[PDB]
Subunit: 330 residues, 4 copies
Amino acid sequence: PRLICINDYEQHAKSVLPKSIYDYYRSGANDEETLADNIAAFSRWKLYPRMLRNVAETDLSTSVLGQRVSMPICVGATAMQRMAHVDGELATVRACQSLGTGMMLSSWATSSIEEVAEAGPEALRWLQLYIYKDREVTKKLVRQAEKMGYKAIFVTVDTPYLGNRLDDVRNGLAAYVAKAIDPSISWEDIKWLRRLTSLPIVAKGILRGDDAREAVKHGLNGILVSNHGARQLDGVPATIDVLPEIVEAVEGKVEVFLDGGVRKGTDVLKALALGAKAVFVGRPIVWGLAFQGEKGVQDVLEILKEEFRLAMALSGCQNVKVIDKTLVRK
Amino acid sequence: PRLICINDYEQHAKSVLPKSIYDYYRSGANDEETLADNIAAFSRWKLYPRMLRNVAETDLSTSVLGQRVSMPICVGATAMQRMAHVDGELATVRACQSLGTGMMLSSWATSSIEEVAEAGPEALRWLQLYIYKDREVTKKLVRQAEKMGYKAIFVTVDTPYLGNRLDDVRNGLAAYVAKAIDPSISWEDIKWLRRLTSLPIVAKGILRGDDAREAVKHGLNGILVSNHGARQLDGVPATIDVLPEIVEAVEGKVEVFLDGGVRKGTDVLKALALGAKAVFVGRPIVWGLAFQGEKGVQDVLEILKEEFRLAMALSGCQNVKVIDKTLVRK
Amino acid sequence: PRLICINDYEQHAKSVLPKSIYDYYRSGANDEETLADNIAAFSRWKLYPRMLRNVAETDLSTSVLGQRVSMPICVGATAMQRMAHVDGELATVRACQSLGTGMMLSSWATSSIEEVAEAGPEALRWLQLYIYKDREVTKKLVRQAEKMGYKAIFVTVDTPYLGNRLDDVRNGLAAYVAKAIDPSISWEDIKWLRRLTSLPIVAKGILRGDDAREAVKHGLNGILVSNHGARQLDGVPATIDVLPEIVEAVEGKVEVFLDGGVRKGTDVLKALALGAKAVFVGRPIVWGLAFQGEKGVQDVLEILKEEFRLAMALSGCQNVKVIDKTLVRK
Amino acid sequence: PRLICINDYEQHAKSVLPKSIYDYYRSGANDEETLADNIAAFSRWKLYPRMLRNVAETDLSTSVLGQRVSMPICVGATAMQRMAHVDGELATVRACQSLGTGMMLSSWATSSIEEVAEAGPEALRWLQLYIYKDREVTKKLVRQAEKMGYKAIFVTVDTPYLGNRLDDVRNGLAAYVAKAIDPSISWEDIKWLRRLTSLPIVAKGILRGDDAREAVKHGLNGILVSNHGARQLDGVPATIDVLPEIVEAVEGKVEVFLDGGVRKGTDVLKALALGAKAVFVGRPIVWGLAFQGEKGVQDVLEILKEEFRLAMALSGCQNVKVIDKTLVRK
Ligand SMILES: Cc1cc2nc3c(=O)[nH]c(=O)nc-3n(C[C@H](O)[C@H](O)[C@H](O)COP(=O)(O)O)c2cc1C
Ligand SMILES: Cc1cc2nc3c(=O)[nH]c(=O)nc-3n(C[C@H](O)[C@H](O)[C@H](O)COP(=O)(O)O)c2cc1C
Ligand SMILES: Cc1cc2nc3c(=O)[nH]c(=O)nc-3n(C[C@H](O)[C@H](O)[C@H](O)COP(=O)(O)O)c2cc1C
Ligand SMILES: Cc1cc2nc3c(=O)[nH]c(=O)nc-3n(C[C@H](O)[C@H](O)[C@H](O)COP(=O)(O)O)c2cc1C
Ligand SMILES: CCCOc1ncccc1CN(C)c1ccc2n[nH]c(C(=O)O)c2c1
Ligand SMILES: CCCOc1ncccc1CN(C)c1ccc2n[nH]c(C(=O)O)c2c1
Ligand SMILES: CCCOc1ncccc1CN(C)c1ccc2n[nH]c(C(=O)O)c2c1
Ligand SMILES: CCCOc1ncccc1CN(C)c1ccc2n[nH]c(C(=O)O)c2c1
């Protein structure tokens, strides 16, 4: 069928995936208050476009942690991509290479670090890391990322335990993940990881300014403002609503990124107006895989790219450097 | 059937137009957040009527850019009127002549500038203009408007590219329009147009006070606060909500007008209380054409006129000069 | 059937009245924004009950314009009561006599001033007045009210013209009323009426503090904060929301009353906490007549009385003198 | 069936109880505005979790009125437990003994004070008291609570009369309760009860800071911020919304508790962040009994315990002493 926006990709995925797999991907934690809010919050921020600026030649390119990208829209870590499409993470990395954007690989990816680097040798690639109770396997992942040309580590800090998604309980794996992830992870473990690698490290899952300041103090290189796609603690705010406090807190010392609820080009524009360098998408990528593997991911990323180009042009922004805080008001 | 308010005209149009044509007229951009808000915002502004003022002889007349009109309710530019009714823009201009109000003719009208002036020789007529990549045809339209007795140019400034209306993609023309409209349009092109004609020029599609001030600085003669009927950038505010900032910004130097969401006489009263000189209606006119051509447009304009008369009388306003800011609070 | 609250009476009335008659009674003006708000606004004001006050002997009695009543809940003027029940206004006045509360008789009542006084000789009775273009018949009504033992005039000031209720247009009388009511009514006509009678006069339909102050300056004896049951100008605020401004404006010089949306005993308590002396009910009385004439009106008034007694007791109020502004917050 | 959250227990109870019994348990007063708000209010308070704190060993234990409990989640008084399950209050007290939390026994319990103490000899048990018109039976209950090892009296102060639950009227007992409960109860009766027993006394049903201060002045030992599960006066605020004012008012002199709307572990966390020592649950316990008596109550309490453990861990709280006001914002 004819899919023209990200919601059409979700609707198609619901129509072709087994219910248990669609529910795993769609679900948030508990009553899904934050899942609704990640989307509703973007709608509350209103755009104040400038007219007559000359937007004939819109340039979406930017950089993430010193590496050039084609657009401020990157693929976030999502476990279990092979349940959406046989090609899983290799399909995703091939789409990212085509688009000129970066892929954050889950540390629970079915495809190995090496396999993804072999499928996307020229793709910008980052590794998402959990600090596992087994620090030997944690270290081995970081060293493999270094050796295979990955350009940053995104350490997930909001998952001492996995969240309670009610459909997953109504429909093994979760127990095996709980056995592996360390609930004792502290700032001392961040000091260890900062000593372990010279790669840029981003703290993924920060929601408070004081924690963002502590990440800067520990010599990390970025914050990804994230509520884990509303899958961890329900009743946290929308990421777009905490973004301004986090940008204020880090005083320009490190790049700030956002995920959670990005579905449209205007969502990207609002996040950049509030000070994010770039945004990451989770579920939209899975819906792309479910439609048509590599070509479906490419289509989702091209829809977001073109929606973002149009939103930039209609708001009077030739390039991402002129996106400013006066474009948005809540 | 018996149609007694503007929403009844829309419902009738949905019942008789081909789905693709109804959807073209009804649709807003993307998720249609602004389309809903243009209407909902009017409901948030509450009326504080004065009693016992003597409203036996209500006078709705006013002026637009120095020309007398019967009511502060005028017809906005809407392309493709011949898809609603065979008589298209000639039906509309004949209704405007009957009512004593003005018609803004789209520059993509099926009827020529001359043909409309021949159908409505005594009608107040304005030309809506896009600055086309072809500046020769742009100049020719302005000269034809001058020669055929049009009294102002409304230059549309919010359309460097056309918006993404999802139903139009689900259901050629849009490509031909994208080929013609210039995305490079800047304030330098406004200086060119201000030098090209002595007619009054109104900037249509301003949403920011700073842009309104720049339009005054370039010697334009009015601002039409407009989000293009919520068809361009989705997630901009409702026009009624940005109107007060724009009125404040221009410090009484030029007339300020409003379109977007006007469906009822109380909408007209709220816009005038917040400082608009007059309001324009888009979609209601198309629904009038779909019902009964000239007589349907006349009926829609008479419903709005009489709703407005009643709202003025119930709020204690004998004429538009006594409509003041204390009538409304958000 | 078993009707235990005012909404059950409405539901029963919808089930037994001809659609055109139910719609006439239920309807508000235009899109019915104020009709919804008159009810929703009461829900936004929250109650802060005091505990342990000794509410064994609750006393609901008060006074209206110097006359004792059994409860601060009185019957408002509603035209056309004989369309709900053959006994119409005689049923209503007999119920008011039983309850010990007052009845405001519409000046468009089917039963004459004399007939109502004959049915309810010991009932507290007031006359609602329109200043008719025919000042002779206006004067004759006031003199008949004086002669037949009525204790006040409620002059309706929000109806220069009748409102636009869409169902009445979809389903004669309205034209005959428009022919009779004077749209020229001004404060000069209030000076005339204040000279015409020594009875207490209440201005019914004031929504602004400045108009309330003008009513005090003209020697009127009360304000009834009213939007005519949301049937006149749509998009005015809820009466409960403007009540505090009007109470503030009159500085205790005259009694302030409220109608619009009273359906429950807690509505009565909120209006008294915000400074109203008493409240009036319109539609609930008509639903009572539709159920069972006099006995139905008596039942509606007894439900409101007992709901109000319970709300007073649960909030720690022994009598209406201890109802204070700290009981409510918006 | 597989019940994994408290709402699933309610849905199951609706499926197995007679409608009249389900409606008795579910219902709130009048239009049930407060019943909806007790739940909606928790959703408006947002959580600001701290990351990287080391939550490997979460400790939920606390104390209530000097007695250790396993978790800050206790069973509130609910009359008529034997209508949900044959074992009624004996099932409930056996579940509380298993969990290591306390049970507040209704003074209208079917099981006697002695019978409950015999079923749960090692359970933490409190008596909820009404001051009955018969002060002899009131005194006898307090003495029996003392003799049978109960550790506090919760005196209910928001019930001079029972509330108006509309389904109970649509579907005897209520008349017998109205005959027994004294509407004259004042602060003088609290002085009497404070002289009658040396047990800790908690005032249950306070919604105002000034009343909370008066309870402290009368030598009571705690406040239970309660609106009686929204069953008394409708249109009072949600308990979570008045909690902060009550905590502020008592200046740390006495413990403050909350009930009303607790359904999830994040509700418990929000109440403790705003200064409650512990929370009580009413309806969830009845749904547990309806499912499977003692084992159903145990399951409900274990679901709340584990939800609360997870919410504490995901918010960076090792124990209840580190739960602070910066975790929440409205
Ligand atoms: C199915 C699924 C699997 C995910 N797996 C991971 C993971 O393994 N590691 C991780 O750090 N984040 C994971 N996330 C969270 C995402 O990285 C990101 O925070 C979130 O998906 C963004 O929200 P969105 O889905 O609304 O874009 C996952 C999210 C989803 C929906
Ligand atoms: C079907 C349609 C066609 C339109 N065509 C034009 C156009 O050619 N030029 C223009 O400046 N505005 C155009 N507009 C925008 C209107 O001039 C106006 O901004 C808008 O219709 C007002 O909102 P309303 O439809 O809620 O009244 C169009 C709007 C619609 C709905
Ligand atoms: C059917 C109907 C007839 C009414 N007739 C009159 C009238 O003749 N004169 C008048 O002053 N107000 C009239 N009112 C307005 C009421 O006096 C009062 O303002 C309103 O009914 C109160 O709102 P409620 O219906 O929500 O209680 C009427 C209202 C209704 C619903
Ligand atoms: C069916 C039912 C019976 C109750 N019986 C009593 C009672 O006998 N005494 C009392 O003090 N509170 C009683 N309550 C109120 C509870 O103690 C508590 O305030 C309320 O249930 C908490 O709200 P929740 O049900 O949302 O948890 C009762 C509540 C319900 C729902
Ligand atoms: C149909 C697939 C069901 O896959 C699961 N079901 C239950 C639990 C875990 C998984 C998958 N795994 C291994 C992970 C691993 C790390 C993760 N980080 N975040 C998430 C998430 O889902 O939000 C993670 C999921
Ligand atoms: C059934 C008719 C489909 O007509 C189209 N369909 C798609 C694209 C364009 C058109 C019509 N044309 C030529 C224009 C021209 C200028 C415009 N300015 N604003 C609009 C608008 O629709 O908001 C414009 C539309
Ligand atoms: C089925 C009955 C239809 O009765 C009508 N139908 C239409 C118009 C008038 C009436 C009734 N009349 C005579 C009046 C007279 C004075 C009034 N003041 N307020 C109202 C009101 O309805 O709000 C009034 C109605
Ligand atoms: C199917 C059972 C219907 O039980 C009733 N029906 C109506 C009235 C009373 C009861 C039960 N009784 C004796 C009590 C006694 C004290 C109470 N305190 N609060 C409540 C409450 O329901 O909120 C109370 C109920």
